[PDB]
Design a protein around this ligand. Structure first.
Ligand SMILES: O=C(N[C@H]1CCCC[C@H]1NC(=O)c1ccc2c(Cl)c[nH]c2c1)c1ccc(-n2ccccc2=O)cc1
Lengths: 52, 234
């Protein structure tokens, strides 16, 4: 069911544009070439516990 | 926080603490970015002049990784009133930017629709703070976190002695002795999704703490995302 099915395989935000899954990300993350994964840009991306 | 567990190293990096002139925490906050803190509007009444401390886990001794920040601008939601406690939300613009490190990191802001469809429909969320660990007691010196179940909308309105507006939501336990408590207000309510935590609520209020038949009342962040966006730009 697109986004209704396991968040449409998106790491973060999942939308439906023209009846198809569209993944997006929060600030500080870039959408990966696969258009599904979110790649953090810095050492302290939002929403991640600091476990160093 | 009554019950729950103390936040181990780096587990709750987005927690913020509002400290008055006497360096004591009276409310919590959520780090949104290097310049902004999210909190409850009702907290702005609890003090005359306050600062924001980040990266602390033990109030007693100065650990070494904490930092105090002065507030440059206080953005209080104009529709708030102690009469209803509706619109219990405020944004703080800090004078100097927060430097991220261990125990100091922002929580992600979700997009309205997705958040409602994917985060709010989750079984649980996490609340944290330095509030009382018992209904009758002092403010905890250790930062604690607690997993609280999302509570049925209809079910919670029945349990409340006050009108639950659409800008509010319930989380917690009907009987089980685990709940937020006094002092945890303004603090973070975050929902985990694939090892990433999004801010979903703000500790607003509760009829006591952990009482049977009662729940914790949080401000629904999805209802103010736009307001939050405008507040972070102005
Ligand atoms: O917080 C209140 N009372 C406080 C003072 C009396 C003793 C209990 C104390 N509890 C807290 O500090 C507290 C804060 C957050 C949470 C969460 Cl989450 C879970 N447990 C708690 C407990 C309080 C404030 C406003 C309303 N109220 C609601 C609508 C309209 C008018 C109105 O006054 C009711 C209760």
């Amino acid at each position: 069911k697109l986004c209704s099915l396991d968040n449409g395989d998106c790491d973060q935000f999942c939308h439906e544009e023209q009846n198809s899954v569209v993944c997006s990300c929060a600030r500080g993350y870039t959408l990966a070439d696969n258009g599904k994964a979110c790649i953090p840009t810095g050492p302290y991306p939002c929403g991640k516990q600091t476990l160093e | 926080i009554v019950g729950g567990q103390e936040c181990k190293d780096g587990e709750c990096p987005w927690q913020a603490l509002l400290i008055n002139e006497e360096n004591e925490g009276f409310c919590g906050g959520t780090i949104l970015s290097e310049f902004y803190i999210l909190t409850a509007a009702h907290c702005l009444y609890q003090a005359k002049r306050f600062k924001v401390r980040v990266g602390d886990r033990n109030t007693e001794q100065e650990e070494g990784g904490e930092a105090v920040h002065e507030v440059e601008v206080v953005i209080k939601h104009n529709r708030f009133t102690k009469e209803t406690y509706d619109f219990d939300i405020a944004v703080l613009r800090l004078k100097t930017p927060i430097t991220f490190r261990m125990n100091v990191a922002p929580a992600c802001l979700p997009e309205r629709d997705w958040a409602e469809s994917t985060l709010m429909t989750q079984k649980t969320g996490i609340v944290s703070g330095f509030g009382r660990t018992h209904e009758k007691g002092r403010q905890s010196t250790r930062l604690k976190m607690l997993e609280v179940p999302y509570v049925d909308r209809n079910s919670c309105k029945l349990s409340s002695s006050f009108i639950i507006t659409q800008n509010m939501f319930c989380a917690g336990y009907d009987t089980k002795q685990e709940d937020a408590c006094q002092g945890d207000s303004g603090g973070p309510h975050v929902t985990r999704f694939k090892d990433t935590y999004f801010v979903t609520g703000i500790v607003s209020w509760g009829e006591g703490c952990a009482r049977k038949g009662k729940y914790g009342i949080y401000t629904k962040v999805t209802a103010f995302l736009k307001w939050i966006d405008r507040s972070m730009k102005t």
